[PDB]
């Protein structure tokens, strides 16, 4: 049983998105679903709720509509209308379908969850600069590397190397705001023996401006 | 709407060893739900109705309480243990969660390994000056970088990020970004990159001249 | 002693091949039967719905033509009933739980007739009134109709015959087979001693029954509540406080059943006319509100989906409640033929309904759906007034088919018939016998 | 007459005294029961275990499997013939007797006995149901607090021992309704009237019944899901197959009589012998419980894939056969336990293979073997121990298809007609019969 | 309650082609689907079955792989494949859904059909030909435009008109074959006062070739 | 499997009419279903289980039989009632449907609507010349239609459609089309549509003017 969010991505303040959910692996109703939401760097709080029929949604204390929930038992589908957005509702919303054991109901199933930021800040594509040992950089037994992606908002790229078949060694920090723009590095750690050797490549992406760079690291002029 | 306080906000144990956390309610609530979060993944529902675990959770847990007092407990948490425990409760309209436990790990001192990068020409090559400098793996978490430039210790352009305890190792990382104009930058040689942490008495410096 | 035992051990279960096969035959024929009956209940209640659209236009000739129409059709029953069997009148099925301890009579050759033909002109009317009565009577009727044609002699064949025909009557007219041998064995049958009834043949009677019944009305249920929820662990106990109104309620009910008998006797005094007049009078009074608010009237069972939907406010329940508990009280205390059964299924699932909305809000951590108490105190009113509530569960239980809810539907129902216990309940279908008995050892 | 004007106006007046030690009689049932059931699983469990852990060495887990399981059916047969041979066999039979007074409740024995020699006899992976441990057990458990107490009347005495053999019997299956039902159309006396409580009876199985939730809920015994429907005209279908559980039923009663008979030469009451043939029996379990999942255990596991039709045509008649035989030894070779749900998996089987012989004969009926699995699983129930109206809400409860009730019932019934006109007998009945005149000499 | 059959078409003799019928307004999951055919002003004639899970699928009397019925339950969607087909082959494809009365089943519901043709000619669109009144417009009460399909393979197309608003006083004809190519035309009375005042569009649909093309009837110059 | 073989292949009847189809089989069948086509239409369920009404089937269809003969009856049979009626019995796997029997209606005369239209521009840009000249709602069925390019009666590169009877007025309708080269067409002039029929001795004609 799969539970896929998808719908958020970036908003000006003021304005208004339509989250959505998919479920798959379960008879979608008899059930009730339920939003809960995550702001970055905090707990969960409850957004609201729906059983089967949609005959009853209750909601977390909210203004007049702040939030409506409703569910298409027929595509199998949760949805969640945010309106009036202010920037306390930038944060990474979840479905969740709901059970219970005794009777004091909990959340059965999660879902990978769909990030909304609240920003009157453009899109912009990212920088990625390859990052290459220095003019005095000793090569010894071990070598770190990495790339920086600086300039670019908002979240999220993700970063691989090599296409992933470098997971052993490889750190990626998270992303700061600076200036109404998100910078993150990421470090790839290998044994001198492999490069300049063979070909350490870095992938950048940063799907909202519909960008993709494999920044090839090279050695040092 | 009841008010669910976790424990230690943060916390850290040694792989084998008994774990416990709290869960003060601010009133009665009954059989609460623990919630297990990776970071990067979604929740999941460990503990459920105060002690009955879920189908697949390792048997080293265990959770009781009653009235206003909740716990979590690991009887020897290992590593895949090492993750964020939310406490939540729905004995009384609206369901509620708690603050969180932060359950990371506990393992030997460990020495940062710094590295300073120039400025890739790609980035000068458009009036842009950073000169990277990582500090991967290490423990405690506590740790601190400064930015000499020909002499002068600079504060001003500075970009630190930790990672959260490696998944695979268990050290904490960080990386400190030096910005500047392609400009100020070529009028400069020196750029050092100190770094003082536990593991040592003086600073483990790593620099680079334009030359 | 326990040298018979072992004797009729090794013998138990060996009823005459022949008891067995008229059971046959008798479940066949109250089941054809039954359907009649039932048929004819609806070309009537459908004649009548005919004639107010011919007249749509004017609208006071219709509130009259509603009240006439079916004014004149209870007064044809009141008649056939008063004029030739006394019996046919009120629920009927006392005159068969009478009648399995010898203490009353069959008369067939009249019963037959005029419980039948007395039912039409009643359900016709649209009266507030079950069928249950009319066909569990009929039922037995037809029991010992085919008891003396065919002759058969011994306690058994008189008893079960006559016991089978009265459950495969109140299976054809619920279409519950289970439903129909738990009522037999539970309430029916003699409760204070030994008596030799075939448990075999009346299942077979039953069966053959309830094949006729499906024969001509399959394809279509007679309540549809389609698949409600599920009763968590920690709302049962709100199944047994509903159990408890309930029980405190049904002998309350009771009281009314048996005193608006005695009321309303005063009116005709007993005379023929004023009876049949009275009873036109109550007749049409539904054949009005049949109309003005269909749910204040009629049988009762169209209500029952759309109140377990909750598709009426919590207002509009308790109008409804009320405005049913007269109209039942009316037409049943009111000699009329006809069941009380069935009225009051739907009477316990408006109460229920109203528990429901209620509960649907003090707790909505429990995630509850008003329905699920619909379909508990369903058969509650079965239990705290009747009080035979293994029967009354395993027919709501057959008629809405929500067997998840059985744990609550019990608890609601048990609590009923302890809670009427300790307030000074009484079997309202053996009271009405203990009176229609007394009555009789009291004219002498 | 007059009086009955009198009693009806005092009918259904049970003390509030007995009205509340139902309640009592059944929580304990209840989480007896569960206690029980549960035990019988860490045991098969550990067994299962075992088997692993030498996983592979081959003729060793041939042998672990059935010494594992010897060791337990012995350590039951024992406890069984050492301090109360009543343990023996089903358990209903004893409590039927005792409802009647012809037989003793001695629960300082049997509830000890009955209980740890049930776990050794089920724990071993033997062909026998849990309702006899249970049923008995729900039993001594209404006695025991009957004296406890202490109590009147033979009321009193008649319903918490009522009661508690009902309760019983629901948390064997979690069927609240065939609980009560059961008591009321076999349990009680039979030919004469008897006082009692229906009422007091309820209050048991529920208390019973919450009790197996509490611990055992959120999972069924038995998951067909909705099968299809009943045509009209595929009743007569039902009829046949309730001819054929019919003329066979009463063949299996004689069967599990003879073989008790038989049996009982080989170890000739020596409880030795008798313990030996024990962990003999319990020993072909645990092999075939492992060889051939399907001859062997207490039989449900089976009846979901039985249904759903996942078994070949061969397939079945072989593993009917197969369990003919070993529900036979286990239920004949005095053990304890019951041979209710055995019955059930029976049924199932030659249901099975009755529908898919009749999904091949008649295409225009669009037929799904499954419908008449679930028809003929209360089919063995009917012809043998000759209850219907129990059998028939007992599958009804645990398969949930309520639509099949009709066919369920034809089945059931034509079973009951052709077993009579047959000479059949009440299993239950006859082995009391027989408790009875062997207490006659 | 809708079933919708598509894929219909083209075929080469000796080939094989995959018919499809989604159907919508009911539990599909609970249903016994069916197929059953007619060739050319021909009767009808039953192809197989297929029963809720798809544990049952009788055929009728045929080769052993000349069909295959088959369900996705989870798309509400039935299946027929032919393969190896022949001109016997050449015909009106219906979608039924069976049930039953006392228990002898028959065809409860039809979809609308789709037509499977084998030929070794080729898939042409229609050319849409309007056809406006003549200039010696006598315009009485009522007046008749039209509008001519002609050149198209295979049949058959539909025709509309003001997308079917223009239900009355239709006529559309049979068509007819001119050396691998068919041609019809649909008439259409209407009242002076509505045309040319109005819009008067005919819609003709060619779905063997998923193309339509709707033609306005303005007048002559 | 059984072959059923329905009674009339056609069958023409006024309204009013008491009307009666068939339908037998090589064995015996039992409980047979009715379907109606419709022109263009697909079959509908009509009755079924051999004599019981689907819903919304006007109590004008009576219908029943036994054995190996069963028949459809229409008592006062209407105008709309003209489709097409199989009958099925799947009784025998594999069911069997019948051939149909074509039900048609006898009404008063009514004279066709001749109009006349000139190969459409596009028509002729491809080089093509279409002159179309439809016949509208007539009865009966028979119709001459007679083609004149400057008063020469033309014979061939004609074709003439006709619809089925129509389910609520019960008359036909006819489509001649007249097929030429572009200037084939451009070279004469004036064209004319005959329609002669037993409505009117003198046939029924419009026509124009190539200009």
Known sequence: VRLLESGGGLVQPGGSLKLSCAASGFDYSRYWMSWVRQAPGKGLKWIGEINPVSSTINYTPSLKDKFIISRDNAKDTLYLQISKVRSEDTALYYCARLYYGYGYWYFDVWGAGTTVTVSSAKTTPPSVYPLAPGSAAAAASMVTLGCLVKGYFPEPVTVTWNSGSLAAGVHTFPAVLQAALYTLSSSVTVPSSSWPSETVTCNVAHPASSTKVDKKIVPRA | ?211 | RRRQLIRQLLERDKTPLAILFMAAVVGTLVGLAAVAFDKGVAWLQNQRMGALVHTADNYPLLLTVAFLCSAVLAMFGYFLVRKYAPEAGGSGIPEIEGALEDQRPVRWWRVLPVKFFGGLGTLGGGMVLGREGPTVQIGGNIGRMVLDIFRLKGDEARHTLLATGAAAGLAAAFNAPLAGILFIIEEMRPQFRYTLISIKAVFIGVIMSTIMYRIFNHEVALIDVGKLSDAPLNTLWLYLILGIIFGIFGPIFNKWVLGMQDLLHRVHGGNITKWVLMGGAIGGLCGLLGFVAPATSGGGFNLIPIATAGNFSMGMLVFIFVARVITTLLCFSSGAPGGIFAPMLALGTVLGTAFGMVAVELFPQYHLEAGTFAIAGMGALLAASIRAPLTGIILVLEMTDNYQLILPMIITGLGATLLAQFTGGKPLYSAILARTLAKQEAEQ
């Open chain 2, 1 to 211: 709407d009841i008010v669910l306080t976790q424990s230690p906000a943060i916390m850290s144990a040694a792989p084998g060893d008994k774990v416990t956390m709290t869960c003060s309610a601010s009133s009665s609530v009954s059989y609460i739900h623990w919630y297990q979060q990776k970071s990067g993944t979604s929740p999941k529902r460990w503990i459920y109705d105060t002690s009955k675990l879920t189908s697949g959770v390792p048997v080293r847990f265990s959770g009781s309480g009653s009235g206003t007092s909740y716990s979590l407990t690991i009887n020897t948490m290992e590593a895949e243990d090492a993750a964020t425990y939310y406490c939540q409760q729905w004995s009384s309209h609206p369901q509620t969660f708690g603050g969180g436990t932060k359950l990371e790990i506990l393992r030997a001192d460990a020495a940062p390994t710094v590295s300073i990068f120039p400025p890739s020409s790609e980035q000068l090559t458009s009036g842009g000056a950073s000169v990277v400098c990582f500090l991967n793996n290490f423990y405690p978490k506590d740790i601190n970088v400064k930015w000499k430039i020909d002499g002068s210790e600079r504060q001003n352009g500075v970009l630190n990020s930790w990672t959260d305890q490696d998944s695979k190792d268990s050290t904490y990382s960080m990386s400190s970004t030096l910005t500047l104009t392609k400009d100020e930058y070529e009028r400069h040689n020196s750029y050092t990159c100190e770094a003082t942490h536990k593991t040592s008495t003086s600073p483990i410096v790593k620099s680079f001249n334009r030359a």
